[PDB]
Amino acid sequence: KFPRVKNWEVGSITYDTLSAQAQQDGPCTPRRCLGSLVFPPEQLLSQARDFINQYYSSIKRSGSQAHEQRLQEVEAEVAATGTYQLRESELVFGAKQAWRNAPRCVGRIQWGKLQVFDARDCRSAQEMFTYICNHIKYATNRGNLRSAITVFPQRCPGRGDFRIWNSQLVRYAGYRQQDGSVRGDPANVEITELCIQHGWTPGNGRFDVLPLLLQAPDEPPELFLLPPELVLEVPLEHPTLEWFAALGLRWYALPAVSNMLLEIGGLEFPAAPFSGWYMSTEIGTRNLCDPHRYNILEDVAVCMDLDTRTTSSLWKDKAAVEINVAVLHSYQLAKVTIVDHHAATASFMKHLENEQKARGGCPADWAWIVPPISGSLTPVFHQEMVNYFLSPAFRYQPDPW
Amino acid sequence: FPRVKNWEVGSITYDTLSAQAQQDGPCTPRRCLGSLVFPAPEQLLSQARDFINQYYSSIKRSGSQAHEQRLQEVEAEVAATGTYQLRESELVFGAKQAWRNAPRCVGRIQWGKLQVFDARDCRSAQEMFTYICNHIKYATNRGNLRSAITVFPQRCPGRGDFRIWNSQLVRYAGYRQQDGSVRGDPANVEITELCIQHGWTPGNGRFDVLPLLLQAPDEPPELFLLPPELVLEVPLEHPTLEWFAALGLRWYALPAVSNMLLEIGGLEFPAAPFSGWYMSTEIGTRNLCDPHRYNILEDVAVCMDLDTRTTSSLWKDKAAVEINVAVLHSYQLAKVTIVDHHAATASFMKHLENEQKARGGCPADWAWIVPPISGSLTPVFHQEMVNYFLSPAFRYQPDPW
Numbered sequence: 188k189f190p191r192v193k194n195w196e197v198g199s200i201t202y203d204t205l206s207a208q209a210q211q212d213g214p215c216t217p218r219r220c221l222g223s224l225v226f227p228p229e230q231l232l233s234q235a236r237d238f239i240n241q242y243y244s245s246i247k248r249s250g251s252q253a254h255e256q257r258l259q260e261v262e263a264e265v266a267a268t269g270t271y272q273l274r275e276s277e278l279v280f281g282a283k284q285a286w287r288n289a290p291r292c293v294g295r296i297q298w299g300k301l302q303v304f305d306a307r308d309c310r311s312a313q314e315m316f317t318y319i320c321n322h323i324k325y326a327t328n329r330g331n332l333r334s335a336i337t338v339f340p341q342r343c344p345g346r347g348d349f350r351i352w353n354s355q356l357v358r359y360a361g362y363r364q365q366d367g368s369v370r371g372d373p374a375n376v377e378i379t380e381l382c383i384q385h386g387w388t389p390g391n392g393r394f395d396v397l398p399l400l401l402q403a404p405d406e407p408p409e410l411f412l413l414p415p416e417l418v419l420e421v422p423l424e425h426p427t428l429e430w431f432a433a434l435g436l437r438w439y440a441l442p443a444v445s446n447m448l449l450e451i452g453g454l455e456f457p458a459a460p461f462s463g464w465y466m467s468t469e470i471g472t473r474n475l476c477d478p479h480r481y482n483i484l485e486d487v488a489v490c491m492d493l494d495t496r497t498t499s500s501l502w503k504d505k506a507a508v509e510i511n512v513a514v515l516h517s518y519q520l521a522k523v524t525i526v527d528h529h530a531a532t533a534s535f536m537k538h539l540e541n542e543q544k545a546r547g548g549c550p551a552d553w554a555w556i557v558p559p560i561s562g563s564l565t566p567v568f569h570q571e572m573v574n575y576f577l578s579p580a581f582r583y584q585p586d587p588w
Numbered sequence: 589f590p591r592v593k594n595w596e597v598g599s600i601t602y603d604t605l606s607a608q609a610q611q612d613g614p615c616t617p618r619r620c621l622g623s624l625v626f627p628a629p630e631q632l633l634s635q636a637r638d639f640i641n642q643y644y645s646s647i648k649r650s651g652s653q654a655h656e657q658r659l660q661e662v663e664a665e666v667a668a669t670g671t672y673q674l675r676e677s678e679l680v681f682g683a684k685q686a687w688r689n690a691p692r693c694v695g696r697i698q699w700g701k702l703q704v705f706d707a708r709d710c711r712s713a714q715e716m717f718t719y720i721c722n723h724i725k726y727a728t729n730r731g732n733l734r735s736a737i738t739v740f741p742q743r744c745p746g747r748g749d750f751r752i753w754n755s756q757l758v759r760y761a762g763y764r765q766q767d768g769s770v771r772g773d774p775a776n777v778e779i780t781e782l783c784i785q786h787g788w789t790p791g792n793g794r795f796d797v798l799p800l801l802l803q804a805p806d807e808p809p810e811l812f813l814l815p816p817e818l819v820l821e822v823p824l825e826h827p828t829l830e831w832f833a834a835l836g837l838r839w840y841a842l843p844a845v846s847n848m849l850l851e852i853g854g855l856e857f858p859a860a861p862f863s864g865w866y867m868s869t870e871i872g873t874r875n876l877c878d879p880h881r882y883n884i885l886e887d888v889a890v891c892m893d894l895d896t897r898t899t900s901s902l903w904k905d906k907a908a909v910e911i912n913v914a915v916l917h918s919y920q921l922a923k924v925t926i927v928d929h930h931a932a933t934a935s936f937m938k939h940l941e942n943e944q945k946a947r948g949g950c951p952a953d954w955a956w957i958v959p960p961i962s963g964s965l966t967p968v969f970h971q972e973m974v975n976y977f978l979s980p981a982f983r984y985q986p987d988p989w
């Protein structure tokens with residue numbers, strides 16, 4: 188009942204005892220495996236109790252002093268109000284633990300290093316905007332990127348929700364034409380359609396930074412133009428392919444996910460944007476080369492005079508490596524923090540080992556940890572992984588419309 | 589009914605065929621073990637009952653004359669003998685089906701074009717060897733490879749199993765070295781040692797083809813050398829890197845897996861070697877670049893003048909891509925069937941469509957279907973998949989030593 192986990196490069200074996208804690212049921216049954224799919228009153232007290240017992244054991248404070256104390260004041264807080272507020276340190280410990288538990292995150296070696304901005308006293312979209320702008324400018328930090336999460340007020344009934352309607356704080360526009368097809372990013376066509384539907388002047392280009400749609404409780408959302416000086420972008424050039432610059436490609440510095448629902452101790456914050464720094468294959472492989480994304484693969488391959496007539500020339504593979512080389516080169520030249528998929532996976536192997544020592548395991552979604560290029564060249568490929576849900580966590584959540 | 593999205597297009601289907609998944613896999617709602625490499629007359633009757641049902645569905649004669657008799661026949665035979673015998677056409681259909689049902693085979697567009705050699709009358713290790721040479725000979729076909737399988741006598745009470753001890757009909761010796769390392773293929777150290785123990789005179793090259801260890805029932809395994817001219821190999825060169833030929837690398841033409849058990853209607857064939865043709869990534873990425881295999885990646889990158897001192901230069905990705913180029917080119921130059929990961933994955937997408945119209949789904953192991961380089965460059969990356977066990981099937985089995 189303790190999963191045997193092997194690494195096929197070294198031969199080492201470990202057991203994931205930590206898997207025994209899994210709260211929210213996963214999508215997989217004995218009869219079918221759905222791991223490859225992307226999106227598969229006083230119950231609050233169970234999750235509240237568990238999270239507090241975590242915190243105190245983590246500060247080597249099990250069964251003493253403030254432990255039983257803090258247990259009572261949340262027993263009382265929920266008793267009176269039907270909810271509870273987190274101690275500042277707990278909201279910090281929960282944000283760090285959610286990141287620690289995100290199975291699909293390959294950068295969790297960094298999980299202990301996170302800056303939590305507390306926006307729990309937020310009211311109105313104009314309020315979030317400055318909180319977001321503080322985060323953004325803090326996280327960006329002139330390119331020396333720093334992980335951060337801004338936690339907006341939790342959720343209560345009879346009130347609306349705090350929601351950032353964008354999936355990320357920096358997203359590129361996507362525009363249709365007299366022929367349906369898209370200029371810009373097709374992953375944002377919808378929110379790009381909303382932003383114009385809420386009165387934003389649409390640009391022309393293929394790299395217009397979208398305006399934020401911020402929503403305050405029980406209130407239709409307000410458009411916000413991000414300060415251009417606040418959106419650090421990296422023009423993409425290639426170290427030795429002088430024409431790559433001419434392709435006019437750019438990506439933004441800050442990967443800030445603004446659509447996931449932080450969940451700590453049974454409290455659900457539908458607006459808790461977190462941000463780190465990119466891994467280069469996110470940009471160079473998925474964002475630019477996915478056929479439903481910028482789909483630049485063939486364009487770059489033409490410019491390299493590759494043979495696009497036969498699949499076995501590996502022109503796709505060759506042009507994709509160069510797009511990734513441009514990404515890493517351009518971010519480094521702009522001194523923007525970025526990590527290549529080799530460095531990143533190797534650190535994750537280091538993380539798995541730390542977590543084996545610390546908590547006897549680590550929930551890891553194999554298919555998202557293995558990078559989208561050069562899979563078996565990175566060690567995580569040869570590492571078996573166990574996927575389960577631990578709390579606290581980042582969860583997906585419905586689009587706020 | 590699991591809903592399955594294709595993210596490249598937006599396609600959405602529901603895998604109704606998963607509902608017939610008979611045997612159980614390793615995943616629970618608690619934890620996903622997808623990424624793990626290695627996850628009574630009445631039961632023999634229901635398996636047989638079902639397969640016979642299957643077979644009569646395929647010949648468009650479901651519930652017909654022959655259908656009832658075969659059920660009662662098989663039951664009377666199982667009652668009388670404890671087991672039953674497949675008719676030859678049932679055997680051809682159960683070997684094709686077991687390839688159809690193989691979740692980890694990207695090459696399943698070919699599942700109906702399968703040459704089934706009935707060796708169920710085999711009598712000794714020696715006859716076994718002859719059947720196998722004729723399999724290799726038929727399949728290799730001078731480089732125009734043909735998919736084939738030889739079904740040796742089924743497991744049955746009172747007699748031990750036929751076994752091919754070798755994991756594949758063509759394998760390269762792996763000699764543990766003086767200084768603790770391996771010469772040849774490290775994946776084949778065990779089987780090499782067994783051969784030597786069984787009186788094989790070892791070589792000392794890197795691409796020494798292994799002898800066959802063939803076990804007739806209730807017999808020690810017997811050692812059989814393959815005629816050199818039966819084992820078509822391909823010397824590896826690069827279309828532009830001319831120093832590449834000086835690496836002395838070779839791979840063989842025929843991927844013939846010989847250690848898997850073939851299951852049809854509850855009957856078990858512990859020896860049924862099957863062969864297709866290679867997908868270049870198996871050779872180019874896995875076999876040559878896995879750190880625990882031939883592990884050539886650094887030597888190629890050094891020879892390529894790549895900067896191997898930083899990972900951000902993507903020297904691993906660049907060097908791997910040219911190794912795969914070399915494999916593809918070397919095999920086309922030698923007129924030996926080979927499919928690249930772009931072509932293979934694109935025909936597997938057709939397979940999934942054909943299988944959806946045919947059976948309402950298709951068992952697929954994403955982590956095995958997605959190639960180990962350039963994953964998201966291929967369409968199967970952006971296809972969600974439902975992995976489950978159908979029968980007939982190729983199963984793993986314990987090594988007979």
Ligand code: HEM
Binds near residue numbers: 289334462531
């Ligand atoms: C510091 C460097 C970081 C790196 C290099 C990194 C990298 C990644 C990558 C490559 C993914 C895969 C997602 C995709 O490809 O779509 C991912 C997912 C994820 N990351 Fe991290 N990340 C970092 C920091 C963080 C932080 C600070 C948080 C939160 C506090 C976080 C939370 C998550 C979550 C929840 C997911 C899963 C989201 C989803 O399923 O869409 N990451 N990360």
Ligand code: HEM
Binds near residue numbers: 696
């Ligand atoms: C004709 C062209 C074929 C191609 C291109 C092909 C391709 C592949 C590949 C790439 C794998 C993954 C193996 C690995 O990555 O190590 C695989 C696995 C597998 N294939 Fe195919 N294959 C072909 C033919 C066949 C045939 C003829 C059969 C059976 C009659 C078959 C049954 C299987 C099975 C059972 C597995 C899983 C073996 C394992 O789990 O280790 N394949 N195939």
Ligand SMILES: CNCc1cccc(-c2cc(C)cc(N)n2)c1
Binds near residue numbers: 442461463465466470
């Ligand atoms: C193409 N990836 C989209 C995507 C989807 C979800 C999350 C990320 C993410 C989040 C963070 C904090 C860092 C990072 N490097 N990535 C990215």
Ligand SMILES: CNCc1cccc(-c2cc(C)cc(N)n2)c1
Binds near residue numbers: 695843845865870871
């Ligand atoms: C790195 N491959 C090892 C391996 C392991 C298991 C199966 C294969 C296989 C089998 C067949 C019939 C065709 C093919 N193309 N591959 C290969």
Ligand SMILES: C[C@H](O)[C@H](O)[C@H]1CNc2nc(N)[nH]c(=O)c2N1
Binds near residue numbers: 222554
């Ligand atoms: C269909 C498949 O599950 C889906 O495309 C997943 C696979 N792995 C991934 N891995 C990462 N890091 N990001 C992704 O978007 C995906 N997509």
Ligand SMILES: C[C@H](O)[C@H](O)[C@H]1CNc2nc(N)[nH]c(=O)c2N1
Binds near residue numbers: 195570955957
């Ligand atoms: C540990 C991990 O599951 C293992 O290396 C798997 C991953 N996916 C694979 N996919 C294929 N096709 N072949 C393999 O050998 C593997 N190995």
Ligand SMILES: [Cl-]
Binds near residue numbers: 442469470474
């Ligand atoms: Cl992104």
Ligand SMILES: [Cl-]
Binds near residue numbers: 875
């Ligand atoms: Cl192989």
Ligand SMILES: [Gd]
């Ligand atoms: Gd030119």
Ligand SMILES: [Gd]
Binds near residue numbers: 828829830
């Ligand atoms: Gd040359």
Ligand SMILES: [Zn+2]
Binds near residue numbers: 215220221619
């Ligand atoms: Zn699973």
